[PDB]
Structure 1
Amino acid sequence: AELLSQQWEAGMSLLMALVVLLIVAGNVLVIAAIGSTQRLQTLTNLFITSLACADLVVGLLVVPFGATLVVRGTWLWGSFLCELWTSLDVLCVTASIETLCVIAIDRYLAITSPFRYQSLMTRARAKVIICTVWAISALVSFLPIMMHWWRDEDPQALKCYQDPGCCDFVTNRAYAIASSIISFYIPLLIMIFVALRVYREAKEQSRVMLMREHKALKTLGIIMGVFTLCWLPFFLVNIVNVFNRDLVPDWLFVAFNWLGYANSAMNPIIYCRSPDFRKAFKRLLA
């Protein structure tokens, strides 16, 4: 009874810490490698840095908080932080998918108008792009949450809000469909459409130099593919609940949200496809 709980609590704590460590180490490495290697200070890598910040915030704030909820079986932190924590979860996935769109659009430009790209894209503009992405993402994630537009009047929902250790994100149907479409489905569709155009236009192409560029693009394709595979299951289930709560078991819905968090750990590994990152990683770790 109490022993079963102790064994579970301690092993789950150990796993959670590992996940945190992997997400924080991996993404600090990416930021530090870029911050300190002129060869890696390209404009595309400024977008990568932004993605790494999104993932780092998941490692430092989103996951640690969720971990305490999984390990201890209740929300220990009060009402405000529960809402802030929710806000930050929506924020990061929103900022991630929006950044991935930008990366795909940056690459489409560079490949179809290399010279028009040359005269448009500067460090100053890349900064504006990044900031705009985080602005829109903040707008779409915080306000509806601070305006309580997500709340329901279901008996289930009143139960949770009248229980100080409840921090499920029980939402009304309108918000579920709206936030999913606005945070995820639309940027998803744009990203896929643009990523396929980048695929067609890369096909209409020293041989050594073009191979190295296609290796790099494939790496970006992989980042986008893995991100879709990590989050699409959660968002699909999010929709399905609006229509039928029985069609898909609870435990798998929760797990899918954790699969989403897990994506924040994957990008640094995936970047080891690149000689340059690999070398910068090995050098940084001394």
Structure 2
Amino acid sequence: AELLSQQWEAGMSLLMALVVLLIVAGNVLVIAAIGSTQRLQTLTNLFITSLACADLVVGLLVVPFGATLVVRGTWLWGSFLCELWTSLDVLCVTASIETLCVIAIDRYLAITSPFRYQSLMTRARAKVIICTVWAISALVSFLPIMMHWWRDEDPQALKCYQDPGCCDFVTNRAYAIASSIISFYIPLLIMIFVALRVYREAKEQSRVMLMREHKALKTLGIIMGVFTLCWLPFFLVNIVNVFNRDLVPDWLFVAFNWLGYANSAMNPIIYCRSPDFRKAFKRLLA
């Protein structure tokens, strides 16, 4: 009874600590490799740095908070931090998928008008693009949350909003659909649509240089595909639950959210496809 709980708490505390360490170490390595290797300071890698910041925030704030909730079975931190934590969760996933759209659009431009690209894309514009993405993402995530537009009137829901040990994200139907569409489904459709024209135009292209470029492209495609596989299950279930809760078991819904958090560990591993990253990772790890 109490032993079963101690076994589970200690083992789960260790797994969680591992997850945190893998997300934080991996994304610090990405940022530090790009921030200290001139060869990696391309405009595209500025967008990768943005993505690695989203993941880093997941590692430092989102996951540790969720960990205390999984290990201890209740929300220990009070109402404000529950709401902030929820905000940072919505923020990070929104910023991630919006950044992946920008990355897809950047490559589309570079591949179809190399010259217009050259004279349009500057470091100063890349910065504005990145801040614009975070501004929109901030807007879409914080405001409806801090303004309580996600709240429901259901007796279960009010039960939780009254309990300071409860931080379930129990939302009304309107918010679930809307935030899903605005945070996820619309950017997903854009990214897929653009990534496909990228594929088409890449196939419509000395040989060594085109191969190195297509390897990098494929890396970006893998980033985009893994992200979709890690988060789509949760957002599918998020919709389906709006119509009929029973059709998908609860434990699964929380697992799918954790699948989403876990994506924050994956990119640094995926970047090891690149000789340049691999070299800088080795050099940095000393």
TM range (shorter): over 0.9
- How far has the Cα of 1:99 moved from its partner? 0.1
Residue of structure 2 equivalent to 1:78? 78
Q: Provide the C-alpha distance between the structure 2 equivalents of 1:214 and 1:70, rounded to a whole number of angstroms.
A: 42
Rounded Cα–Cα distance in structure 1 between residues aligned with 2:94 and 2:154 = 27
Aligned to 2:277: 277
Tell me whether 170-179 or 155-164 shows the greater mean CA deviation.
155-164
What is the deviation of 1:163? Answer: 1.0
Instruction: Name the CA distance, whole Å, in 1 between partners of 2:53 and 2:117.
Output: 26
Shift of 1:184: 0.1
How far 1:127 sits from its partner (Å)?
0.1
* CA shift digits 1:26-55 (9 cap, x unpaired): 000000000000000000000000000000
Matches within 5 A, 1:1-286: 1-286=1-286
- Kindly provide the CA deviation profile for residues 153-177 of structure 1, in whole angstroms up to 9, marking residues without a partner as x: 0011011111110000000000000
5+ residue gaps, structure 2, are none
TM-fit CA distance, 1:197: 0.3
Deviation at 1:205, TM superposition (A): 0.7
Deviation track 1:188-225 (CA, whole Å, cap 9, x = no partner) reads 00000000000000000110000000000000000000
Provide the C-alpha distance between the structure 2 equivalents of 1:238 and 1:97, rounded to a whole number of angstroms. Answer: 17
Aligned residue for 2:148, secondary structure, equals: coil
Q: For each residue in 1:55-97, what CA deviation from the matched residue of structure 2 results, as whole angstroms up to 9, or x when unmatched?
A: 0000000000000000000000000000000000000000000
State the distance in 2 between where 1:190 and 1:269 align.
25
RMSD: 0.3
Partner secondary structure for residue 253 of structure 1: helix
Query: Which TM-score applies when normalising by structure 1?
Result: 1.00
Measured in 2, the distance between the counterparts of 1:68 and 1:158 equals 23
Alpha-carbon distance in 2 for matches of 1:207, 1:162: 64
CA shift for structure 1 position 124 = 0.2
Q: Take 1:87 and 1:64, find their aligned partners in 2: how far apart are those partners?
A: 15
Task: Output one character per residue of 1:115-162: Cα deviation in whole Å (capped at 9) or x when no partner.
Answer: 000000000000000000000000000000011000000011011111
Task: For 1:47 and 1:187, locate their aligned partners in 2 and report how far apart those are by CA, in whole Å.
Answer: 16
Aligned partners of 2:7 and 2:91: how far apart in 1?
34
| Partner Cα separation in structure 2 for residue 87 and residue 180 of structure 1 | 14
Task: Provide the rounded CA distance (Å) in 2 between the counterparts of 1:205 and 1:98.
Answer: 27
3-state SS of paired residue (1:152): coil
Aligned-partner Cα distance in 2 for 1:161–1:62: 20
SS at match of 1:246: helix
C-alpha distance in 2, partners of 1:227/1:261? 10
Report SS of the residue matched to 1:92: helix
Q: CA deviation at 1:244?
A: 0.3
Q: Work out the CA distance in 2 between the residues paired with 1:115 and 1:158.
A: 58
Could you say what secondary structure the match of 2:76 adopts?
Answer: coil
Q: Distance in 2 between matches of 1:40 and 1:207?
A: 22
TM-score, normalization by structure 2: 1.00
Per-residue CA deviation, residues 93-115 of structure 1 (Å, 9 max, x unaligned), is: 00000000000000000000000
Question: How far did 1:181 drift?
Answer: 0.1
Give the whole-Å Cα distance in 2 for the aligned partners of 1:21 and 1:250: 28
Gaps of 5+ in 1: none
The size of the alignment, in residue pairs, is: 286
* Identical-pair percentage: 100
SS in 1 for 2:97: helix
